[PDB]
Design a protein around this ligand. Structure first.
Ligand SMILES: [Cl-]
Ligand SMILES: [Cl-]
Ligand SMILES: [Cl-]
Lengths: 304, 306
C-alpha cells in the first residue's frame, strides 16, 4: 500500500509528497457536469513540483547519477521546481545552486535561501535566458555539478504516470470523462494522460494554453490571462480553493467544457498545481492588495 | 466517525480535508536518544491548526442553532489564523464574515482575509485589540443576526483538539506517547490534546512551552523558550528536516529537543506540534535574517555570460 500518513509516523517529509486530496467544485459550478480538482496545492511545499523534485532525486540517485555530498545540483528556475529542488536537496545533503534574474521578487529569493540553496542573481535585461546561461556555465566549470533540467525532462511525465494519474483514477472511482491540465513544462498533463489511457479510460484529454505537440491531446483550449486571474479570485470566495494563475486557467477551462451538452452528468478532472499564498504579493492578487491598502479607519470617537 | 479517506475518495467540501494531518519524525536535527514526533498541523488546507477551530465553530454553532447559514453575519475581532479560517470557511458556507482589526496589523494579514471575501474593518492603532473588540460589539448591538465568533472560539477550542487532534496522535504513535509538548495561550492544542491523552489512560508528561524575549493539573512542566532560540530553530529546521513553520513551531521544536536530552527520555517518544506553515511569515521578522541576506546579493555582470 502507499504510506498511510493519516495513521503512521513518517520517517521523512518526502513521504508526505503526493497522495493529495481531490475535491468537487460546488458553488462555482452551475453546470450539469461534475468537476473534480486534484489538489496538488496540498503537497508539503505547496505545489505539484514537489513530485518532480522527489522524482529527480529519487530516480537520479537510483541510476547512480546523483551522489549525496558529492553532486552539486544546479537549476535555472525561479518557480516551484527550484523551490522543491532546494527543499529536498537540503534534507538529502546536496548543495543546491539556483540561478535567477535579479528582477524576481525578494520573496522568491527568500524561499530558496531558507533551504540553504545558493542563490545566484543574473542581469534583469537577460531575463531567464541569462539564468540558464549562468547555470550551464556553473556546471561546465565543475565536473561534480549537474543541470537538474536534464532530469526534469527525463522523469516528469513518468512520475505523473506512476503516481498522480493512478491516484486520480482511484479517487474518481475509475470514472473520468475529461482530463484538463496546462501545456506548460513540469506539469501533470502528459503523465496523467498516459496513465488514463493505460487504465482503459476513454477520458478526453484537454491541454490549456494561457493567453497571458502530443498524440495524447484531444483538444487545446486557449484561456485568456484575465479569465484565469478572475477565476482564481472567484474560486477562493466560492469554494475556498486558493491557488495560482495555472489553477485559475484550468478551472476556467473546466467550467467551459462543463457547459457542453455532451458533458451533462460526466466527470471532468483538472489540477490545482500550487497554493495561492505564494502569489499574494504578485499581480494575480494585486486587485485585493490595492483594495485593503486604502481602507478607511473607524474614528476613536465611535468606539465607546 | 466513518473518517474520510481523502487519499482515496473525492471530497464534497474542503472542510473534509481539515485534520487527519501527518506526523513526522525529526531526523537530522534530533541528535538525542529520544524519538521526536511532529504533528504537522501546517498541512491543513489553510496552512494552520486553526482550520480545526474554524471548522468546529461553524459545525458546532450551527448544530446549536446559533449560526444560521444565509442569515448570520460572523463577526470576528482577530486577524490571526483563526480569523483566516473563519473567513475561509464562512465564504464556502455562504456567511458574510466581518473582521475587525487595528490599522497597525500587517497589510499581508488584511490581504489574506480579503482574499476570502471578508469585510475587513480597521480600528485606530492607539486603541489596539480593545478598539477592534468595541467595533465588533457595535456591529452586533445593531443587528441581532450578527454574531460574535470569539465566544465560540473560547467554547470549542479545547474540545475540538480533544475530539480530533489528540486521538489522531494517539493512533499515529500506536498508543506510545511519553511526552506531549505544546505552547501556552489560547488557540493551542495543549489543553485538548492533554485531555484526550489522559482520557485514553496515558500518563505522558505534559510540557507547556512559554515564549519569552485544566491550566493547572494538566501541566507537568513549563519550559521557557527565548524568542531568539525559537527563531533560530525555525531556520535550522527548514535546512535539516525540510519543515517550514512559524515562531510557535520553532519554540516547540526547541522545547522538544531540550526534553529529548533528559536522561530519562532515552528511547522514549516525545510528540510536539507544528501549528502553521512558514510561508505566511516570510514578510515578518521571523525570517528577516534571510530577507536581509538575499536583499544584498550581488548580480552577475553581463560580461561573465558573454
Ligand atoms: Cl499540472
Ligand atoms: Cl496554480
Ligand atoms: Cl508555527
Amino acid at each position: 500500500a502507499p504510506f498511510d500518513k493519516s495513521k503512521n509516523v513518517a520517517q521523512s517529509i518526502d513521504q508526505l509528497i503526493g497522495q493529495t486530496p481531490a475535491l468537487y467544485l460546488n458553488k462555482l459550478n452551475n453546470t450539469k457536469a461534475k468537476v473534480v480538482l486534484k489538489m496538488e496545492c496540498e503537497n508539503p511545499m505547496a505545489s505539484v513540483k514537489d513530485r518532480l523534485g522527489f522524482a529527480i532525486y529519487d530516480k537520479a540517485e537510483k541510476e547512480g547519477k546523483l551522489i549525496p555530498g558529492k553532486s552539486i545540483v544546479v537549476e535555472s528556475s525561479s518557480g516551484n521546481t527550484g523551490v522543491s529542488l532546494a527543499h529536498l536537496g537540503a534534507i538529502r545533503g546536496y548543495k543546491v545552486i539556483i540561478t535567477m534574474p535579479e528582477s524576481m521578487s525578494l520573496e522568491r529569493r527568500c524561499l530558496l535561501r531558507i533551504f540553504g540553496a545558493e542563490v545566484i542573481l543574473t542581469p534583469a535585461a537577460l531575463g531567464m535566458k541569462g539564468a540558464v546561461a549562468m547555470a550551464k556555465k556553473i556546471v561546465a566549470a565543475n565536473p561534480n555539478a549537474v543541470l537538474a533540467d536534464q532530469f526534469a525532462t527525463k522523469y516528469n511525465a513518468l512520475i505523473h504516470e506512476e503516481t498522480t494519474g493512478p491516484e486520480i483514477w482511484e479517487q474518481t472511482n475509475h470514472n473520468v470523462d475529461c482530463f484538463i491540465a496546462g501545456v506548460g513544462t513540469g506539469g501533470t498533463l502528459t503523465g496523467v494522460a498516459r496513465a488514463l489511457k493505460k487504465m482503459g479510460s476513454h477520458a478526453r484529454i484537454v491541454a490549456v494554453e494561457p493567453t497571458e505537440d502530443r498524440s495524447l491531446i484531444d483538444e487545446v483550449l486557449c484561456v485568456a490571462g484575465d479569465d484565469a486571474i478572475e477565476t482564481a479570485l472567484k474560486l477562493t470566495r466560492s469554494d475556498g480553493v486558493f491557488c495560482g494563475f495555472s489553477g485559475g486557467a484550468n478551472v476556467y477551462a473546466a467550467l467551459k467544457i462543463a457547459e457542453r451538452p455532451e458533458m451533462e452528468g460526466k466527470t471532468i478532472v483538472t489540477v490545482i498545481p500550487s497554493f495561492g499564498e505564494r502569489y499574494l504579493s504578485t499581480t494575480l492578487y494585486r486587485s485585493v492588495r490595492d483594495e485593503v491598502s486604502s481602507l478607511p479607519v473607524v474614528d476613536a470617537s465611535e468606539l465607546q
